[PDB]
């Protein structure tokens, strides 16, 4: 009995949104920023592209957009609420494209563990299109749970 990706999307989205609410229950600013950035993210992707969106997040963290592995990014090491949220969103989005909801889940990502931004700047347009659609799909679910759970 298999599962659909939608189930994994919803599961992953709930998990990462609950993780923020847990680590920053007293910080409404961090929660409010993450929700704003999750809401903003799909529109940036449609207008500017997924690669430009991932790079846009990294630039907010003042990281070199060419020399950063997503796993190395630890959101709990930033001061302002903005960079904490950007780091979370970048981390969650990259983790989804890279690992999905786990190696033994119904969806283990698209980039086979490779950093999504590095993947984009290395692969073909069709690969990027498939990842772009998937990025939009996971963000839709992140937005859903952020809207209901995260407070301002």
């Amino acid at each position: 009995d298999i599962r659909e990706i939608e189930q994994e999307r919803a599961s992953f989205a709930f998990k990462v949104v609950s993780d923020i609410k847990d680590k920053y229950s007293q910080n409404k600013k961090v929660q409010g920023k993450y929700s704003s950035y999750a809401e903003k993210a799909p529109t940036i992707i449609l207008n500017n592209g997924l690669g430009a969106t991932l790079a846009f997040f990294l630039s907010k963290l003042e990281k070199p957009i060419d020399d950063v592995d997503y796993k190395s990014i630890n959101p709990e090491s930033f001061g302002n609420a903005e960079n904490i949220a950007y780091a979370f969103l970048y981390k969650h989005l990259s983790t989804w494209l890279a690992e999905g909801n786990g190696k033994d889940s119904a969806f283990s990502g698209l980039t086979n563990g490779e950093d999504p931004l590095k993947y984009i700047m290395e692969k073909t347009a069709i690969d990027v299109a498939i990842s772009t659609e998937e990025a939009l799909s996971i963000l839709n679910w992140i937005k859903k749970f952020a809207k209901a759970m995260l407070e301002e």
Binding site: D1, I2, E4, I5, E6, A106, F107, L110, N112, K123, T124, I126, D127, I130, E133
Partner: protein, 331 residues
Amino acid sequence: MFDMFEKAVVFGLYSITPVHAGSGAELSVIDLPIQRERHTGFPVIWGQSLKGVLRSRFRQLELDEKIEVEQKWKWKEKTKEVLKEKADEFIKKVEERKRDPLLTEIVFGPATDGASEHAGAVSVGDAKILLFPVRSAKGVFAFVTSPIVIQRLKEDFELVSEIENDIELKKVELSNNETIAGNALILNGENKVILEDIVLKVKSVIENLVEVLKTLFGDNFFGKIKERIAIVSDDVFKSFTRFSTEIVARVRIDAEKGTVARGGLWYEEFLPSDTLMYSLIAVGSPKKLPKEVDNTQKIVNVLKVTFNNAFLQIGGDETVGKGFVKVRAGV
């Protein structure tokens, strides 16, 4: 051991527009669903729907003397050749739409007025799904089928084999997360396929299935596929046929206010284009007769020439471009 029939023809049906073979309105979110086999959930076109379509086309062709038998078929002359004396009164019935032209009634049976005279010579089987189109992350879409469909195709070949008395005319196992698929569907360096919202692992059959499709429909496939064929498990295939059909909201707009009128919003289901279905058409001895069509073989020949490579419209909503299919009729 199928001696009630003598010959059979497989009618391949390829949709080039969405198709709504209807079953009627329901108290449900989908107000107008398409025809389905209830215990499998598979989309079908009932034989009586297809027969009505075939009959109407054949009838119009005979009235316009476009029917080819062996030269042109003049139904009025052949009517006089068969009915002799009372032939004139029969022709008058036809012009009044009380009866149908001679060959039409021989093949499909008499119009409702003469129902008790004799039965029809041909048996129009229900159309069943063979290939169902499903969106794919790579390769745009896949022609999806399953072992139970392949099995039913083989069993129908056994029917044809029994009817034509041709013994010469007469194994796919898959997990639910597995697929046997063409190269165009497979993601770059992953050995996986994503159909709709399901990830399927590629398994190392298609070439043989194509060879079968090449037998029935000729060397060309309806004037056009192995690279986008995907074989999935029976239950996964079933879910696709039930949840990957087109569901469309339609409205009626008040011509003066430019707004949706009351009783003017409903949801309607459509079988997608690029769907391959097939019906088994069995032919028995005519039960009504001119020498040109006095036996089974001659009736088969007329059926093959009349409908092969032809275009038909099946189901409702013809006026909004639905139900258009291309037909291939092979023995």
